[PDB]
Design a protein around this nucleic acid. Structure first.
Ligand SMILES: CC(=O)N[C@@H]1[C@@H](O)[C@H](O[C@@H]2O[C@H](CO)[C@@H](O[C@@H]3O[C@H](CO[C@H]4O[C@H](CO)[C@@H](O)[C@H](O)[C@@H]4O[C@@H]4O[C@H](CO)[C@@H](O[C@@H]5O[C@H](CO)[C@H](O)[C@H](O)[C@H]5O)[C@H](O)[C@H]4NC(C)=O)[C@@H](O)[C@H](O[C@H]4O[C@H](CO)[C@@H](O)[C@H](O)[C@@H]4O)[C@@H]3O)[C@H](O)[C@H]2NC(C)=O)[C@@H](CO[C@H]2O[C@@H](C)[C@@H](O)[C@@H](O)[C@@H]2O)O[C@@H]1O
Ligand SMILES: CC(=O)N[C@H]1[C@@H](O[C@@H]2[C@@H](OC[C@H]3O[C@H](O)[C@@H](O)[C@@H](O)[C@@H]3O)O[C@H](CO)[C@@H](O)[C@@H]2O)O[C@H](CO)[C@@H](O[C@H]2O[C@H](CO)[C@H](O)[C@H](O)[C@H]2O)[C@@H]1O
Ligand code: CA
Ligand code: CA
Lengths: 177, 208
RNA sequence: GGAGGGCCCGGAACCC
RNA sequence: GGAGGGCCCGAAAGGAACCCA
């Protein structure tokens, strides 16, 4: 089973994207050109492993990768529309409230969404997996949970989105009372 | 030998008396040497005989897919009883056993919140109506939308997502023409879950 | 008219 | 204090977590 890299890895440089070709003999070929930079790990049993760190720009340009071939999903990429939604008035009676980020109209589904405040990553947030919309693109929601007081006292939060179809592959939207 | 898969009932089926929940045991990868398959069902150890098996199905991949459906009782499923499906085929060393049941744990009542379109989205001709459903447990749930008491079909719902507090949440998005939003239509998000009163609740949403 | 381009029949869908 | 009750402690019993006025 040949697996693709993590969207973030392919998105942010700090990380390193890699493909995985999960008496074992490996032979990798990027668009044919056999390469020798792969690396494997320990082992398992019975019937594996081995990873080829790909280059951000290569994977992005849909280069082929085999050892079973694999590459970036095909189709015209579509840029995400990012919308922030404040908590429901009904949620204002709870100790914590939900700050919502809607990300829709993107393709491929490989994306990374984060929340921050004061240039610092927020901790308590969860993002749904991408969901196929009726128009061929995907959408997801990311929920930030914060103490009710951090919201009412004016703190400003930002939803950050990274995706290949975005200018500079990144965008963000803020949210505050 | 062939493969086996046990499917739980539809969340909405276990929650409404007007519906009949059921468990499904599907067997694929069945050979022709012996396309004969036997099913044995057990409810918490005890074997039951009310299962309905459907005749084998010729699959494009030159194989057979055989299905057995077992009717379960609403309260049984919701109370945690386990359902075991034992398959038997000579083209298989030992009989395959699959067991399924509702997830263990204290059920939690989902909190339902409707969110209007973002001001920025109002520049579009199409807008999103959002329904946030959080804090529920187990993850089995059903979500629907209506407008003025009538069925709305243009919505997509995310799968449940495990939250940091041990509970699940999800979002449901209904897409409507901006004009219908601005004209005062009253939209409503309906949720069905065991931990809800009467297993049902709904929140309205309309232009203020 | 171009030049690009998986989830309704190479195309629709999807930067000038 | 009363009653229930998978995704950190505990090897596990079980508990933290999670309706009762
Ligand atoms: C080996 C080979 O080459 N032969 C082929 C067969 O393998 C192939 O059959 C498939 O085998 C796979 C095993 O390799 C199976 O993988 C497992 O898939 C399940 C998810 O299955 C869901 O969803 C599928 C699509 O999302 C759908 O196709 C399946 O039929 C099934 O749908 C659900 O069915 C149940 C049963 O009816 C529904 O139950 C509901 O129950 C309610 C109350 O009980 C109520 O009554 C409802 O009315 C009733 O429907 C349920 O609603 C359906 N849900 C959906 C999604 O619609 C997955 O969970 C498994 O995951 C686990 O196992 C894997 C290992 O693979 C692990 O990695 C995971 O971690 C999990 O542990 C498996 O992935 C696959 O399901 C089999 N598919 C079928 C059709 O049975 C056959 C059939 O191929 C189909 O597709 C094409 C090839 C086509 O050309 C046709 O052949 C055919 O349509 O083909 C060869 O024989
Ligand atoms: C989250 C996760 O578990 N995925 C990790 C792993 O996924 C395997 C996955 O295999 C998919 C299945 O596909 C067919 O439909 C099946 O019939 C099977 O053939 C096959 O299993 O799920 C199975 C369990 O069912 C299991 O083998 C794995 O969970 O795939 C990668 C490792 O095998 C792993 O990705 C890693 O490597 C990539 C590089 O490509 C990333 O850069 C990361 O380093 C890391 O995530 C993946 O996360
Ligand atoms: Ca095509
Ligand atoms: Ca435990």
């Amino acid at each position: 089973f040949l697996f693709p890299p993590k969207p973030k890895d392919t998105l942010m440089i700090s990380r390193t994207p890699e493909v995985t070709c999960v008496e074992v003999k490996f032979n990798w070929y990027v668009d044919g050109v056999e390469v020798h930079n792969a690396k494997t790990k320990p082992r398992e049993e019975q019937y594996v492993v081995s990873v080829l760190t790909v280059l951000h720009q290569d994977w992005l340009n849909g280069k082929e990768y085999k050892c079973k071939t694999i590459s970036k999903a095909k189709g015209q990429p579509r840029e995400p529309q990012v919308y922030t939604l404040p908590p429901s008035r009904d949620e204002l009676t709870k100790n914590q409230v939900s700050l919502t980020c809607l990300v829709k109209g993107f393709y491929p589904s490989d994306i990374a969404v984060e929340w921050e405040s004061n240039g610092q990553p927020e901790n308590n947030y969860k993002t749904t997996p991408p969901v196929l919309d009726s128009d061929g693109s995907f959408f997801l929601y990311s929920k930030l949970t914060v103490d009710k007081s951090r919201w009412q006292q004016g703190n400003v939060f930002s939803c950050s989105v990274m995706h290949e179809a975005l200018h500079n592959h990144y965008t963000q939207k803020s949210l505050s009372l």
